Amino acid sequence: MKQYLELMQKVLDEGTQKNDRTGTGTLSIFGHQMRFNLQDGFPLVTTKRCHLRSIIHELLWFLQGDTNIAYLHENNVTIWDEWADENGDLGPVYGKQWRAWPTPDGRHIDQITTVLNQLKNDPDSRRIIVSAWNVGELDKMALAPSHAFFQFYVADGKLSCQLYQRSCDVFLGLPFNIASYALLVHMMAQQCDLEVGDFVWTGGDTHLYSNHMDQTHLQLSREPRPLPKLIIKRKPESIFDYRFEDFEIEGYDPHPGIKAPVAI
Amino acid sequence: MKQYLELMQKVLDEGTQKNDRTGTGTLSIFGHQMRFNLQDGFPLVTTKRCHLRSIIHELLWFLQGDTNIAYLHENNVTIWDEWADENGDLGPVYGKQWRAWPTPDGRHIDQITTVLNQLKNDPDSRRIIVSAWNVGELDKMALAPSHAFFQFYVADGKLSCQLYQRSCDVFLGLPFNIASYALLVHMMAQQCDLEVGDFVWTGGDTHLYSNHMDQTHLQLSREPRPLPKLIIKRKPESIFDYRFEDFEIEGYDPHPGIKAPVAI
Numbered sequence A, B: 001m002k003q004y005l006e007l008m009q010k011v012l013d014e015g016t017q018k019n020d021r022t023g024t025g026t027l028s029i030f031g032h033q034m035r036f037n038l039q040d041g042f043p044l045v046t047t048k049r050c051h052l053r054s055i056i057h058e059l060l061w062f063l064q065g066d067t068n069i070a071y072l073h074e075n076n077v078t079i080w081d082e083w084a085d086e087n088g089d090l091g092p093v094y095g096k097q098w099r100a101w102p103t104p105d106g107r108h109i110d111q112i113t114t115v116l117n118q119l120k121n122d123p124d125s126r127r128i129i130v131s132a133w134n135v136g137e138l139d140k141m142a143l144a145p146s147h148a149f150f151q152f153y154v155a156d157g158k159l160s161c162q163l164y165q166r167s168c169d170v171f172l173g174l175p176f177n178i179a180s181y182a183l184l185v186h187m188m189a190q191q192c193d194l195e196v197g198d199f200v201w202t203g204g205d206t207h208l209y210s211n212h213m214d215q216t217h218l219q220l221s222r223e224p225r226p227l228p229k230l231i232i233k234r235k236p237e238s239i240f241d242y243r244f245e246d247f248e249i250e251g252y253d254p255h256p257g258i259k260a261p262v263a264i
Ligand SMILES: Nc1nc2c(c(=O)[nH]1)N1CN(c3ccc(C(=O)N[C@@H](CCC(=O)O)C(=O)O)cc3)C[C@H]1CN2
Pocket: A050, A051, A054, A078, A079, A080, A169, A172, A173, A174, A176, A257, A258, A259, A260, A262, A263, A264
């Protein structure tokens, strides 16, 4: 996609060399923003083939509050295997914080149900927020949350969302992250009877791994194709009742996929 | 400042009318970003006179972990009076979360001391984050945190910071918020022996209150003046040991101040 290739180029031209947690080395910029008008099409990268199966199942997994990789294996998704312990556990990452954030006084807060209540009763609210950054549980998580903090906004009958992503693997992670949140905006809007508006992506440390350089040059030589359309076939009774079958991505005709190593 | 007046104009030209919590009514956009290179000067608005006394004391107050307004009154600062209860308490807002975030299992996490440790031992870390958005305590806070989430970044010997502000009163709040965080970046960099880099401001619901319209037009008629310089006179032994006296703002020569009502 145009916005995506522009970011890749900017990281190449303006990025500084930086060591990192994984010992791989990166080219990094700090602070970037881009916007996708979801009415123009579903923002799924076309300059390389993206595995939709993994994207959709990861989101449905977050929404059930699961942090164990069994559900992903049941469905042949292996994107979280490198960080799981011997029992398949990741600790209280994304899904746990979204569905059951533990309080000091012994309760669990379901942020997703709260957001639903806000959007149906107080759509003008400026506090429609989900956070995965639970400071008290960071030390139990296999990875600190990357897509950490997100806000909904309603104007003129349209639902928008902004994600703050503190750390962004531009090649491997970002195409999944944009599609994942775009899907959520479509699900939320369907459940609340709203039209879709904008997805606004904001990044902190936004980087290319040094062993993604050839794959990056290859992809930048290719021309984006038209964006596909997302069709949701059914209105489930709740946001927690979607199924893989319910989604159709029509007119997705990407360039071939490019393999690259994940930095562990 | 140029970036600031450009935002004001954009909200006037592109903002949509929106009701709000306070019943005042706003013009609102969603999602905006701007960047201040702190080496070019201290980003204190010059098209209206800003009360530096209130800005500096509010920051020193956050840093001591205080959520009671007594310290502010001691120092003739009254910017938080409308939301305090009969004993001067705001609940566990900003300062409490920064200095003593309560965990489910009974501990308190001092995020500021953690950040200091990270910047001195793991400056390349992509997890150098402070959050005020403690989901488990939101219902005890007089106001949900506006400047909610911030990240530090080190590159090439320079310290940068990005703030996510979910809700931004463009006229009254933003000039204080930009100066407040810029000050913190200068304090942090001094304590860590780094040069200052960029302050990156990101906003969610970014708005003009409807009863700030005349004051907004007045300010947009004025030409920005040169940015002042910030001098820190002393290196205290720690980030918690700064005093009002320690800061000099040299060459600040603003246009007159513009009064406007605060929406409660
Ligand atoms: N350095 C780094 N670590 C990470 C992630 C990341 O993006 N970067 N993550 C984002 N998430 C993943 C995990 C794997 C793939 C991945 O390998 N995708 C490949 C293979 C696709 C497939 O196997 O189905 C690709 O698009 O070509 C895509 C997304 C999970 C999470 C795990 N930790």
